């Protein structure tokens, strides 16, 4: 029952130094909550910023970094740059569970490929099946994530899966929905969804992950239609 909570919305200037902010409900937020923090962009486009409070993914420009402050954690962008306007999450790590916060909405007045087909249409009652192939990188040494967005609604963490036996942890809303598995040869992670209805309707992203470094990358999002 653990909230996140983030800042909903920040209008900065470009060169202006922000921070935008994460808080868990339960308490000062940890190291051993292995926060996380991710960019989206126009059309439901993630990046992976920061992994594990501190860490800039590679590749990231310096001016972002993540740090604890006081009881909370913290995104600092030094030198607001026009094509950062964008909305940023946090995820907190609470024992088997990831949680995502809000987002904020910040508004500037200005190798790793994980593939995924951009849409599915499928029938009510029916399943689907969809993949994240992936190269660039060693494929069994990563797992794979899966979060789901439904329309309105804020982003939930699915599950994983380890391509070192296979082994799966589930969010307890996924956890009788979704099935996850992989293809070592073809470097494709998959989820089937059960039993679809209306409600499954939503856009459906892998992500990679590993002990220590999660959603560092990420698919460009499946957008999965339940309709007749
Ligand atoms: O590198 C080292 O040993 C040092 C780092 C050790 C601790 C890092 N913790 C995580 O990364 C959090 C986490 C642990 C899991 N677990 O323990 O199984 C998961 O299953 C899981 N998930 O997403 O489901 C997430």
């Known amino acids: 029952q653990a909230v996140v909570t983030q800042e909903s919305a920040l209008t900065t200037s470009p060169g202006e130094t922000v921070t935008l902010t994460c808080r868990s409900s339960?308490?000062?937020?940890?190291?051993?909550?292995?926060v996380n923090w991710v960019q989206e962009k126009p059309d439901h486009l993630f990046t992976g910023l920061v992994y594990?409070?501190?860490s800039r993914v590679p590749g990231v420009p310096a001016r972002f970094s993540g740090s604890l402050i006081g009881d909370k954690a913290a995104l600092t962008i030094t030198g607001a740059q026009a094509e950062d306007e964008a909305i940023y999450f946090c995820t907190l790590w609470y024992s088997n569970h990831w949680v995502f916060g809000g987002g904020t909405k910040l508004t500037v007045l200005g190798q790793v490929q994980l593939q995924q087909p951009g849409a599915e249409l499928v029938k009510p009652g029916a399943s689907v099946k969809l993949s994240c192939k992936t190269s660039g990188y060693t494929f069994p040494y990563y797992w794979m994530h899966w979060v789901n967005q439904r329309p309105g609604r804020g982003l939930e963490w699915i599950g994983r899966i380890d391509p070192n036996g296979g082994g799966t942890r589930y969010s307890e809303k996924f956890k009788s929905k979704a099935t996850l598995t992989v293809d070592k040869p073809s470097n494709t992670a998959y989820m089937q969804l059960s039993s679809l209805t209306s409600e499954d309707s939503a856009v459906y992203y892998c992500?990679?992950?590993?002990?220590?470094?999660?959603?560092?990358?990420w698919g460009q999002g499946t957008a999965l239609t339940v309709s007749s």
């Open positions: 339960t308490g000062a937020v940890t190291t051993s909550n292995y």
């Open positions: 992500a990679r992950g590993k002990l220590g470094q999660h959603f560092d990358y």
């Open positions: 594990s409070t501190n």
